[PDB]
Design a protein around this motif. Structure first.
Motif, PDB file in Angstrom:
ATOM      1  N   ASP A 189     -36.882 -25.681   2.463  1.00 55.81           N
ATOM      2  CA  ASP A 189     -37.507 -25.894   1.065  1.00 55.81           C
ATOM      3  C   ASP A 189     -37.217 -24.733   0.088  1.00 55.81           C
ATOM      4  OD1 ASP A 189     -38.811 -27.578  -0.517  1.00 55.81           O
ATOM      5  OD2 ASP A 189     -40.235 -28.148   1.049  1.00 55.81           O
ATOM      6  N   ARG A 190     -36.654 -24.989  -1.132  1.00 55.66           N
ATOM      7  CA  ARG A 190     -35.886 -24.083  -1.829  1.00 55.66           C
ATOM      8  C   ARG A 190     -35.922 -24.463  -3.301  1.00 55.66           C
ATOM      9  N   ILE A 191     -36.011 -23.363  -4.144  1.00 53.82           N
ATOM     10  CA  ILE A 191     -36.126 -23.327  -5.619  1.00 53.82           C
ATOM     11  C   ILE A 191     -34.804 -22.854  -6.180  1.00 53.82           C
ATOM     12  CG2 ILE A 191     -37.343 -22.458  -7.824  1.00 53.82           C
ATOM     13  CD1 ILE A 191     -39.868 -22.427  -5.953  1.00 53.82           C
ATOM     14  N   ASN A 192     -34.048 -23.329  -7.178  1.00 53.66           N
ATOM     15  CA  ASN A 192     -32.896 -22.540  -7.627  1.00 53.66           C
ATOM     16  C   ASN A 192     -33.328 -21.747  -8.632  1.00 53.66           C
ATOM     17  OD1 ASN A 192     -31.101 -25.625  -6.959  1.00 53.66           O
ATOM     18  ND2 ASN A 192     -30.787 -23.678  -6.018  1.00 53.66           N
ATOM     19  N   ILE A 214     -39.895 -21.108  -0.975  1.00 54.93           N
ATOM     20  CA  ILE A 214     -40.964 -21.046  -1.928  1.00 54.93           C
ATOM     21  C   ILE A 214     -41.892 -19.864  -1.742  1.00 54.93           C
ATOM     22  CG2 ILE A 214     -42.989 -22.750  -2.360  1.00 54.93           C
ATOM     23  CD1 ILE A 214     -39.724 -23.782  -2.534  1.00 54.93           C
ATOM     24  N   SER A 215     -41.933 -19.354  -0.713  1.00 52.59           N
ATOM     25  CA  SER A 215     -42.913 -18.008  -0.619  1.00 52.59           C
ATOM     26  C   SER A 215     -42.319 -16.880  -1.064  1.00 52.59           C
ATOM     27  CB  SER A 215     -43.123 -17.658   0.846  1.00 52.59           C
ATOM     28  OG  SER A 215     -41.821 -17.350   1.627  1.00 52.59           O
ATOM     29  N   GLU A 216     -40.958 -16.869  -1.695  1.00 52.18           N
ATOM     30  CA  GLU A 216     -40.296 -15.677  -2.521  1.00 52.18           C
ATOM     31  C   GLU A 216     -40.764 -15.809  -3.964  1.00 52.18           C
ATOM     32  OE1 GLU A 216     -36.338 -14.234  -1.297  1.00 52.18           O
ATOM     33  OE2 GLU A 216     -36.195 -16.356  -0.428  1.00 52.18           O
ATOM     34  N   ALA A 217     -41.491 -16.860  -4.519  1.00 52.42           N
ATOM     35  CA  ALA A 217     -41.555 -17.013  -5.775  1.00 52.42           C
ATOM     36  C   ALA A 217     -42.539 -15.928  -6.350  1.00 52.42           C
ATOM     37  CB  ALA A 217     -41.879 -18.515  -6.476  1.00 52.42           C
ATOM     38  N   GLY A 218     -43.681 -16.010  -5.569  1.00 50.90           N
ATOM     39  CA  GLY A 218     -44.625 -14.898  -6.025  1.00 50.90           C
ATOM     40  C   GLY A 218     -45.457 -15.533  -7.207  1.00 50.90           C
ATOM     41  N   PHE A 219     -45.964 -14.333  -7.822  1.00 49.01           N
ATOM     42  CA  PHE A 219     -46.726 -14.710  -8.989  1.00 49.01           C
ATOM     43  C   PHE A 219     -45.652 -14.984 -10.093  1.00 49.01           C
ATOM     44  CE2 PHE A 219     -50.296 -12.763 -11.635  1.00 49.01           C
ATOM     45  CZ  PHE A 219     -49.839 -12.992 -12.724  1.00 49.01           C
ATOM     46  N   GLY A 237     -46.978  -6.885 -11.602  1.00 53.04           N
ATOM     47  CA  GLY A 237     -47.291  -8.141 -10.674  1.00 53.04           C
ATOM     48  C   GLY A 237     -46.337  -9.332 -10.725  1.00 53.04           C
ATOM     49  N   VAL A 238     -45.664  -9.469 -11.940  1.00 51.37           N
ATOM     50  CA  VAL A 238     -44.930 -10.707 -11.826  1.00 51.37           C
ATOM     51  C   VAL A 238     -43.647 -10.510 -10.975  1.00 51.37           C
ATOM     52  CG1 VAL A 238     -43.480 -11.976 -13.420  1.00 51.37           C
ATOM     53  CG2 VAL A 238     -45.572 -10.866 -14.500  1.00 51.37           C
ATOM     54  N   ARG A 239     -43.324 -11.731 -10.217  1.00 52.79           N
ATOM     55  CA  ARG A 239     -41.934 -11.833  -9.494  1.00 52.79           C
ATOM     56  C   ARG A 239     -41.024 -12.744 -10.030  1.00 52.79           C
ATOM     57  NH1 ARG A 239     -43.911  -7.701  -8.663  1.00 52.79           N
ATOM     58  NH2 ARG A 239     -44.523  -6.614  -6.840  1.00 52.79           N
ATOM     59  N   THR A 240     -41.639 -13.659 -10.690  1.00 49.44           N
ATOM     60  CA  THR A 240     -40.689 -14.829 -11.091  1.00 49.44           C
ATOM     61  C   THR A 240     -41.210 -15.176 -12.388  1.00 49.44           C
ATOM     62  OG1 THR A 240     -40.263 -15.801  -8.996  1.00 49.44           O
ATOM     63  CG2 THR A 240     -39.918 -17.272 -10.660  1.00 49.44           C
ATOM     64  N   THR A 286     -54.625 -19.197  -6.834  1.00 48.56           N
ATOM     65  CA  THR A 286     -54.168 -20.471  -6.778  1.00 48.56           C
ATOM     66  C   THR A 286     -53.332 -20.665  -7.997  1.00 48.56           C
ATOM     67  OG1 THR A 286     -55.995 -21.310  -5.709  1.00 48.56           O
ATOM     68  CG2 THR A 286     -55.000 -23.005  -7.408  1.00 48.56           C
ATOM     69  N   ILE A 287     -53.727 -20.364  -9.319  1.00 45.43           N
ATOM     70  CA  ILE A 287     -53.214 -20.723 -10.602  1.00 45.43           C
ATOM     71  C   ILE A 287     -52.184 -19.871 -10.693  1.00 45.43           C
ATOM     72  CG2 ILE A 287     -53.329 -20.555 -13.070  1.00 45.43           C
ATOM     73  CD1 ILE A 287     -56.353 -21.183 -12.503  1.00 45.43           C
ATOM     74  N   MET A 288     -51.635 -18.684 -10.206  1.00 49.48           N
ATOM     75  CA  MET A 288     -50.594 -17.876 -10.784  1.00 49.48           C
ATOM     76  C   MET A 288     -49.557 -17.640  -9.594  1.00 49.48           C
ATOM     77  SD  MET A 288     -51.470 -17.058 -13.641  1.00 49.48           S
ATOM     78  CE  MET A 288     -49.949 -16.558 -13.771  1.00 49.48           C
ATOM     79  N   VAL A 289     -49.852 -18.060  -8.548  1.00 47.66           N
ATOM     80  CA  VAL A 289     -48.770 -18.289  -7.257  1.00 47.66           C
ATOM     81  C   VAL A 289     -48.903 -19.792  -6.605  1.00 47.66           C
ATOM     82  CG1 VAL A 289     -48.536 -17.320  -5.011  1.00 47.66           C
ATOM     83  CG2 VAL A 289     -49.410 -15.740  -6.753  1.00 47.66           C
ATOM     84  N   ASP A 290     -49.879 -20.213  -6.111  1.00 52.70           N
ATOM     85  CA  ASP A 290     -49.827 -21.496  -5.446  1.00 52.70           C
ATOM     86  C   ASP A 290     -49.357 -22.630  -6.613  1.00 52.70           C
ATOM     87  OD1 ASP A 290     -50.626 -20.081  -3.348  1.00 52.70           O
ATOM     88  OD2 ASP A 290     -52.812 -20.863  -3.436  1.00 52.70           O
TER      89      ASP A 290
END
Ligand SMILES: [Zn+2]
Ligand SMILES: [Zn+2]
Ligand SMILES: [Zn+2]
Ligand SMILES: [Zn+2]
Lengths: 331, 331
Positions: free
Chosen positions: B1-4, B12-17, B60-63, B314-318
């Motif tokens: 499962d991946r995001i471009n 998905i788990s790499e997107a983070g905040f 804290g932003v990652r993406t 939940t709002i900023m990550v999930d």
């Protein structure tokens, strides 16, 4: 004395037979880079343009002026590619047509002047290719932004000697307001071509511009939907006046003493994304000669109607050279 | 499962905040390439964006999701440069905002769908960089062309699972018509974020969208001209509602049971040529934290007002991960 082309400076005597208002592609900024498949491919468009320019060159054309601006989607690297492969000089343009984005529309006269001067004096994008003409437009009464554009074009011309050429809605006599704006900035009319002037039969309008020293662009001679009256798109684009009606305005202005002020072209193209889909199928059926229409059909038609060869040489060779070669005057 | 992203696929788990609605530059197609000095230089703009993204990452932003389209002047090569230098993932967009040129405006739904699919499935320009979101816009009642764009965005999303995010005039309740159009094409609302929803206080509007399953983009939280009421440009752009008023809509929708449907951002930028000159001086005075405003100021403000940490995660990550990861559903 030199004119900037997309392959570098040329001397005035190298321009030869020149088509003063043409396009390789009528598009929008960024569009050819983002969606080349619209045109089949970038290579298909380039190949089409090379075939067309080669046929034009065989008919006697040596130079075209591609009056595509930023907002017509001008791709100077494409122009240089096709210029070299067809052995036809191409002069590129700066300025803005009537589809500027918000990043242009929000700019002041001074800012626009900087932009136009960038493209004439420094280069287009990061290519080092310099424009040799400034293109502007109205479609009826100028918008506030279009008035700014015409003022900036005048300032750019006044610094560099590069001329200005215009799109009009000729039926609305836009050239009157264009001239007013240009003159308020101190621009000499010998540095201005009021274009699409063959879109009207109004000689009062045309001679009022020519009498004040403007060049008159009779640049849509093959534009006609006669034979295609039931294609609404085609009729709306091309009108229902014949190519002969248009070409006879060249004779009319000669007969009125303005031979030295006439510039003749086709306003042709090889791709056209700023109009309805498949419009090139229509254009190539209407005028299979393309950019060779002026030398192959119009030049013989005017000779047949009694215009001297010497006069046709003045119009297709000497007037473009005098107009393009940089000066604050051209007479 | 991946995001471009602009540097390739991420899990998905790499997107983070994640900041779901941001810009590196708000411009126009071709503008940064043609007139980089508008921004000082291309390198000055890149350096400004890297400094800003690095401060965001420290907070804290990652993406970020750069929702600049073709007609916002999206330069994916700039995004990849700044993404690598700041170590922040950037998701690019396809779609069209509200400044499309004629070459886009004349296109059919089917043609636009091809274009959007090009940018998601093949790549942007000749870069091979693929979009991970589709951006669309209205500014009041849809124009005929905007309706085509929303339909094409729905078709592109239905083929690929990539979500759609919107610009609205929230005061005119544009999200109602947007939803209607999307649903007529069969698009699931879980694939749609109705953006600039914090520009209105109308909870009847906001909960009607959330109740039907839309994601609600509260993405202009730092937008306020309070303190600058005599700058007409600034007031017109930013409004006169406070950042606290906006941030409290995040709490309001949490309190109504919609935590899983809220996406929060800044709608910030580092360059802005599609508005008045020198507007960045205003924006950087109004919100010196830039894109770090959400983590540095909004997150603490909502904790202080009683929103649980678990909910803010939940709002900023999930929610961004569930929204971005491709699917015809996301719940
Ligand atoms: Zn024109
Ligand atoms: Zn033209
Ligand atoms: Zn927006
Ligand atoms: Zn935005």
């Amino acid at each position: 004395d030199r004119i900037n082309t997309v392959r570098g400076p040329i001397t005035i005597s190298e321009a030869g037979f020149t088509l003063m208002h043409e396009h390789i592609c009528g598009s929008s900024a960024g569009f050819l880079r983002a969606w080349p498949e619209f045109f089949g491919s970038r290579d298909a468009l380039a190949e089409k343009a090379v075939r067309g320019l080669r046929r034009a060159r065989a008919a006697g054309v040596r130079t075209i002026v591609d009056v595509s601006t930023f907002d017509i989607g001008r791709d100077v690297e494409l122009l240089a590619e096709v210029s070299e492969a067809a052995d036809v000089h191409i002069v590129a343009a700066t300025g803005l047509w009537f589809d500027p984005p918000l990043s242009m529309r929000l700019r002041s006269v001074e800012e626009l002047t900087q932009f136009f001067l960038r493209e004439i004096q420094y280069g287009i994008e990061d290519t080092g290719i310099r424009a040799g003409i400034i293109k502007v437009a109205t479609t009826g009464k100028a918008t506030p932004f279009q008035e700014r554009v015409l003022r900036a074009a005048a300032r750019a011309s006044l610094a560099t000697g590069v001329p200005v050429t215009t799109h009009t809605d000729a039926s609305q006599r836009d050239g009157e307001q264009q001239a007013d704006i240009f003159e308020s900035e101190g621009l000499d009319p010998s540095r201005v071509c009021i274009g699409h002037s063959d879109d009207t039969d109004d000689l009062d309008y045309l001679t009022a511009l020519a009498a004040r020293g403007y060049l008159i662009g009779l640049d849509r001679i093959p534009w006609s939907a006669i034979g295609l009256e039931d294609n609404a798109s085609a009729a709306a684009l091309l009108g229902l006046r014949s190519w002969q009606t248009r070409a006879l305005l060249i004779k009319a202005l000669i007969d009125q003493g303005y031979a030295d002020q006439i510039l003749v072209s086709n306003d042709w193209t090889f791709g056209f994304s700023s109009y309805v889909t498949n419009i090139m199928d229509v254009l190539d059926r209407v005028n299979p000669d393309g950019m060779a229409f002026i030398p192959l059909r119009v030049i013989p038609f005017l000779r047949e109607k009694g215009v001297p060869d010497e006069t046709l040489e003045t119009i297709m060779v000497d007037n473009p050279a005098r107009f393009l070669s940089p000066t604050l005057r051209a007479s």
